[PDB]
């Protein structure tokens, strides 16, 4: 079914079938100019043929400017085998570093 992954499971291997949905949801504070991204600063999947990906932001319930919420990546796996989702919490025009918070998970088909 929907498989629910968070920051506590960075670097896990989740088993899945073709086409089940994976909510990967992580904190993201976009007001700082840092969102989560695949390599190259894009939210699209590097391989649209291995898996397909959408994301959304969810602001917080507060009027505090600079309050931060939660990003979801709704990853559907489209092919058999194992799949690293590598996201990085960074500022796209500036690019990642050793110091960027990183997130990965390994999606395994069948």
């Amino acid at each position: 079914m929907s498989h629910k992954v968070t920051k506590a499971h960075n670097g896990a291997t989740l088993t899945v079938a073709v086409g089940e949905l994976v909510e990967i949801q992580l904190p993201s504070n976009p007001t700082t100019g840092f969102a989560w991204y695949f390599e190259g600063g894009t939210k699209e999947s590097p391989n649209e043929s291995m898996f397909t990906v959408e994301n959304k932001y969810f602001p917080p319930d507060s009027k505090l400017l600079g309050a931060g919420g939660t990003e979801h990546f709704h990853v559907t796996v489209k092919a058999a085998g194992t799949h690293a989702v590598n996201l990085t919490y960074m500022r796209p025009w500036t690019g990642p570093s050793h110091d960027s918070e990183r997130f990965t998970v390994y999606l395994k088909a069948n």
Partner: protein, 257 residues
Amino acid sequence: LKLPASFDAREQWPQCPTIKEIRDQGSCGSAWAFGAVEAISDRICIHTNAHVSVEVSAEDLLTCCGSMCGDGCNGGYPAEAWNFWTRKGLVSGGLYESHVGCRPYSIPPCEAHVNGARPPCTGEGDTPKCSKICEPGYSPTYKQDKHYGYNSYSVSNSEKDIMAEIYKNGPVEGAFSVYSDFLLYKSGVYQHVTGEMMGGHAIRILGWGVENGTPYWLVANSWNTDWGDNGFFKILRGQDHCGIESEVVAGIPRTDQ
């Protein structure tokens, strides 16, 4: 003569370095502090005729305002920012690892240094402890380093009332709803074509102009120097576009030497 068609405070006040300066909030949601301290520094300078010039620490407003201003790196209120100013003070403090003033900003962008790169740039981690101790070597001690404000008012939702305030008095703070395409912004008069709501964001309006027939506010961001135009940007003016004219606030500094 009442009011120019183009205005830029950087070039109206040459002798005030800060008005040109673009700080960087790192990963905290603290622009709410940044917009205040940045106008405050500008105002202090302007309202002494460049006889006093100082980078006001955002670490100060960031770390010692507690809940009366909001939540630190989890977000805050510009207007609360300014009377915390007026009623406590705010010390000198500069950029990450500058070693300028009493409290330098203690959060980094993420590329350059690794040793004790210290609190890193993780998820929604805590704000820094309120420290109230000057960096070693910085000379005037904590409470004597404080600059106070006179008051803090809001500007009404007016275009003419904001251009007045800015031209008499220097840059203000304000805020606007940020939507996806905003971060995607690289030059021009921003206007929202798409994206959902991202949240509100505090900023510093220093000026105005018309380009390509589109009237606009000159705003300074707190996302470093390689965002946008050297940290700066433009946003459509006159239409309360994204609340940019809605929430403006300023003070007059207590200048008693």
